[PDB]
């Protein structure tokens, strides 16, 4: 059933990959056609935990759930503000596994400006993901959108194959952090 996006996020040696129930929250998977082409000639695929679930010392991840999703994705974590402050997260990870790793992440778009304050506190936020071959900076967009699949939010996901030895993450708000990663070979 579940499509490639829902399987990688969590809603066999073979060269054949066979309108399902995919993607709780509405959004898009950047470079979706490229990721599917890389999984056609997949020799080995496995999931190993990456950034820790409890690592978010000053950030809360127990409230990240959407009623249109029924909870949230298991591979990623939806970080919400703790108490009344949202400090800038500066998390980094270096690939210690021998095989190639696939790390994904997402950025959530709020409904309006009042929700942006009620969730991530900081008005102007950003999400900067850095690797050895990419330099991206994503700024979330806020606009009134018609409800899709139950709610009016949006989430834009990304991905990048990681070489041994480092992904640097930096976000000041509206950032769906990864909890687990996929190691390909």
């Amino acid at each position: 059933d579940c499509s490639v996006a829902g399987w990688l996020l969590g809603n066999e040696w073979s060269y054949i990959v066979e309108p399902v129930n995919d993607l709780c929250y509405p959004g898009d998977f950047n470079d979706y056609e490229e990721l599917k082409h890389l999984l056609s000639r997949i020799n080995h695929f496995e999931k190993i935990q990456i950034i820790p679930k409890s690592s978010w010392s000053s950030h809360e991840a127990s409230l990240g759930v959407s009623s249109a999703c029924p909870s949230f994705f298991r591979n990623v974590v939806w970080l919400i503000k703790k108490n009344s402050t949202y400090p800038t997260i500066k998390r980094s990870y270096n690939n210690t596994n021998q095989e190639d790793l696939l790390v994904l992440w997402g950025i959530h778009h709020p409904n309006d400006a009042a929700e942006q304050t009620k969730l991530y506190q900081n008005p102007t936020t950003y999400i900067s993901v850095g690797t050895s071959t990419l330099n991206q900076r994503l700024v979330p967009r806020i606009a009134t959108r018609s409800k899709v699949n139950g709610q009016s939010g949006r989430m834009e996901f990304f991905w990048t194959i990681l070489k041994p030895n480092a992904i640097n993450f930096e976000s000041n708000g509206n950032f769906i952090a990864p909890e687990y990663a996929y190691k390909i070979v």
Partner: antibody, heavy 128, light 110 residues
Framework: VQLVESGGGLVQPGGSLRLSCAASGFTFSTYWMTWVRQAPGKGLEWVANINQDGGEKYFVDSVKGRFTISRDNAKNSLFLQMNTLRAEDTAVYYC??????????????????????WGQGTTVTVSS | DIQMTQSPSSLSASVGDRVSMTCRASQIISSSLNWYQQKPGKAPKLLIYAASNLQSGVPSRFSGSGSGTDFTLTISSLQPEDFATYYCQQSYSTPPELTFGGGTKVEIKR
């Protein structure tokens, strides 16, 4: 959140006119704009689109090159000049605003458009 | 240019029946379509965004379904307040061009 279309009237065949759509209520510079016309007693027909930044604007082919569509985010309004009106252009012109998503529902996803705020519209009868 | 074909043009049903209409496309438009309700002499109103998803303000009677080529819009229990013409709008070529289909007029029998 209200849209007001103005600029309609009687235009002789071969003349020109300009429509005026004023926005009020919502942030105007963050949403696309769309004109939609409805012939008397007939169905809806799309006219034009304009991006948030006034630099990308598609057209409805049948009236391509006949008239241009411009906007001014400062004055919070959308324009629609008209030139060389034929008899088939006599219709009620609706002004609507809609957000342009890129959601991926299903196996593969494309662009998704949806107009949610519609104006009253001004009748533009173009006859002799 | 994408071509939409909605059927039937006219319709008549008593207050309380189950009315349903179809809107087919000449090209696979995925689930990128919209439904609109236009009262006589008024402005159209957004009902269904991307097939099954609903918009705030629409009663629970309306519901849309379909995926790919042709789609269907079904009304639970037809009420006398639902007398209007219902169009379907394309969205697969949203940047370049969307094509409205010839709506399906709904009339009430009493």
């Amino acid at each position: 959140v209200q849209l007001v279309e103005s600029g309609g009237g009687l235009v002789q065949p071969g003349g020109s006119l300009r429509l005026s759509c004023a926005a009020s209520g919502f942030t105007f510079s963050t949403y696309w704009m769309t004109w939609v016309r409805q012939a008397p007693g007939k169905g809806l027909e799309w006219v034009a689109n304009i991006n948030q930044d006034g630099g990308e604007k598609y057209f409805v082919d049948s009236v391509k090159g006949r008239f241009t569509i411009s906007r001014d985010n400062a004055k919070n309004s959308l324009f629609l000049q008209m030139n060389t009106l034929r008899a088939e252009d006599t219709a009620v012109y609706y002004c609507a605003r809609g957000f342009l998503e890129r959601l991926l529902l299903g196996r593969q996803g494309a662009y998704y458009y949806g107009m949610d705020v519609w104006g009253q519209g001004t009748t533009v009868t173009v006859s002799s | 240019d994408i071509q939409m074909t909605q059927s039937p043009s006219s319709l008549s049903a008593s207050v309380g029946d189950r009315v349903s209409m179809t809107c087919r496309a000449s090209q696979i438009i995925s689930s990128s379509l919209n439904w609109y309700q236009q009262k006589p002499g008024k402005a159209p109103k957004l009902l269904i965004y991307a097939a099954s998803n609903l918009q705030s303000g629409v009663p629970s009677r309306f519901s849309g379904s379909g995926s790919g080529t042709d789609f269907t819009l079904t009304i639970s229990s037809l009420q006398p307040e639902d007398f209007a013409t219902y169009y379907c709008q394309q969205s697969y070529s949203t940047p370049p061009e969307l094509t409205f289909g010839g709506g399906t007029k709904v009339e009430i029998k009493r």
